[PDB]
Design a protein around this ligand. Structure first.
Ligand code: ANP
Ligand code: ANP
Ligand code: CL
Ligand code: CL
Ligand code: CL
Ligand code: CL
Lengths: 284, 284
């Protein structure tokens, strides 16, 4: 039997702010769809008592179980619903019925940072340093919570009402190599220990991503562009990248310190928040 | 400018067997579609002079260039078109026009081994040992050709007319982590050197895959089934798996020798072909 009794909040919340009232679908008005993912259909929704606007994601138990990702979904909901930070997309709670799982999510109205990046072509130093400050703050909170997988690529960053970053959890079901097989776990078995060990090398890797992200913010494209997989792997492992002429000395300093091959040499998150280029240009 | 003058065959071939006749679309009758992939539409086709049946894949230059995978496609065509082996899907040649690239492929009529596995639930020892022999022979030829990426997962194995294995090249454009960004390379940049180094640990990894595949053939599912990514990574790196009661002593011996954590301890391809369980049950 597949248990949908998650270790996650399912109590009704009074947004105007012994067994308790649980969520139900009848608690929500439904608006237009916000998007469709691999397993989720996201709708604009409104809790009826408070009229509070949020996002409701509907997933289907049958296809979750058929793809073998139901246990991963449970883990994501339990993990995400216990993170509380202004720059982390809030998961308020969940409920389920005979065929569906419902996730009650913070609504982020201004799209992803990746789309904003594509619209503006590139970000100036003030917005870049402000985004980096927000992500460094969120990443410090996350390490405090010992969260498994981190992803701060711009396509995983949503934008709040006042333009604040919201780290999302897109692509939770597709971390395994792509394939046409039914279940979304099997292809991992074909990775030998030598390769899977790289996926467990997870600590100072958020510092690397921070440097790549700062580069992509300022330049508009990531720094290790190559024509084939093997070339790209070599560019990354040997940290072979250059800056366009307009990138300033302070920006170059921070990015080059974050993109050190030796993880030991990468700065701590505290040093990023104290970096002179960050404090000079960040509005936070 | 994007060059479509590949270092790959484009001369007309006389299948009944100084500038030369080049392929053209008018050389082929087109039949029903065989499938649609991410960038390719595959059709049953027939060369008109010889009436030889093959598979024609049409790709579109605009979407290849938009996704930034045109250079990778060129590399795959150049690599694949120089491999010549009875168990490797032949790429006979290519041509192109103003908007499209055409790949002339060996037609494999009996589907993928993954589908056959799902139909039969599991394979007996004779078919298993025969498939493993064919793949070990093909992998020896490949190392002789120093081919970059190897993939022998059952969903990447097509079946010839008499049931012979044909190693395909499915999913060539999606080796990077999945994302909603336009270009299919950028997400690699966010992998630090410590993780990308695992993707370059490529030699005795075909021996690992051979063991996983032999297990999945005989059992019907891969050996490291877990409920979450992190559990799965631990199961793989610590090689924690068991056999159902029906798996024979010879099968257990070969699989356990192939699934050693230390790559040095994994047998050579020659030893696999000489293994007593293989020779006892392989019809080849
Ligand atoms: N909280 C949200 N606020 C606003 N828009 C959202 C929110 N969550 C998702 N969206 C939109 O809906 C789209 C699909 O989201 P999502 O369903 O999470 O995709 P996914 O990564 O495939 N995960 P899943 O569907 O669960 O497999 C996103 O690309 C956004 O445009
Ligand atoms: N040579 C072939 N013989 C028979 N069937 C084939 C052949 N090539 C492809 N097919 C079928 O067509 C489907 C799609 O193939 P393909 O286009 O290679 O998928 P893909 O992995 O997404 N590669 P691409 O489309 O180039 O991005 C496969 O799942 C097969 O069912
Ligand atoms: Cl490559
Ligand atoms: Cl370095
Ligand atoms: Cl996990
Ligand atoms: Cl071992």
């Amino acid at each position: 039997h597949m248990s949908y009794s998650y270790d996650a909040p399912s109590d009704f919340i009074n947004f105007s702010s012994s067994k308790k009232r649980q969520w139900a679908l009848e608690d929500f008005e439904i608006g237009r769809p916000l998007g469709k993912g691999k397993f989720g259909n996201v709708y604009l929704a409104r809790e009826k008592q408070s009229k509070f606007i949020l996002a409701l994601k509907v997933l289907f138990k049958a296809q979750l179980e058929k793809a073998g990702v139901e246990h991963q979904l449970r883990r994501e909901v339990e993990i995400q619903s216990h993170l509380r930070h202004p720059n982390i997309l809030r998961l308020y709670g969940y409920f389920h019925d005979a065929t569906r799982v419902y996730l009650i999510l913070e609504y982020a109205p201004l799209g992803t940072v990746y789309r904003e990046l594509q619209k503006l072509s590139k970000f100036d130093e003030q917005r870049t340093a402000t985004y980096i400050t927000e992500l460094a703050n969120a990443l410090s909170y996350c390490h405090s919570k010992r969260v498994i997988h981190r992803d701060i690529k711009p396509e995983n960053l949503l934008l709040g009402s006042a333009g604040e970053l919201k780290i999302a959890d897109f692509g939770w079901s597709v971390h395994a190599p792509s394939s046409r097989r039914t279940t979304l776990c099997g292809t991992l078995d074909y990775l030998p220990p030598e390769m899977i060990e790289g996926r467990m090398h997870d600590e100072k890797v958020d510092l690397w991503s921070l440097g790549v992200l700062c580069y992509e913010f300022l330049v508009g494209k990531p720094p290790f562009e190559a024509n084939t997989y093997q070339e790209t792997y070599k560019r990354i492992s040997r940290v072979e990248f250059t800056f366009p002429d307009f990138v300033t000395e302070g920006a170059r300093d921070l990015i080059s310190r974050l993109l050190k091959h030796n993880p030991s040499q990468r700065p701590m998150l505290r040093e990023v928040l104290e970096h002179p280029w960050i404090t000079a240009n960040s509005s936070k």
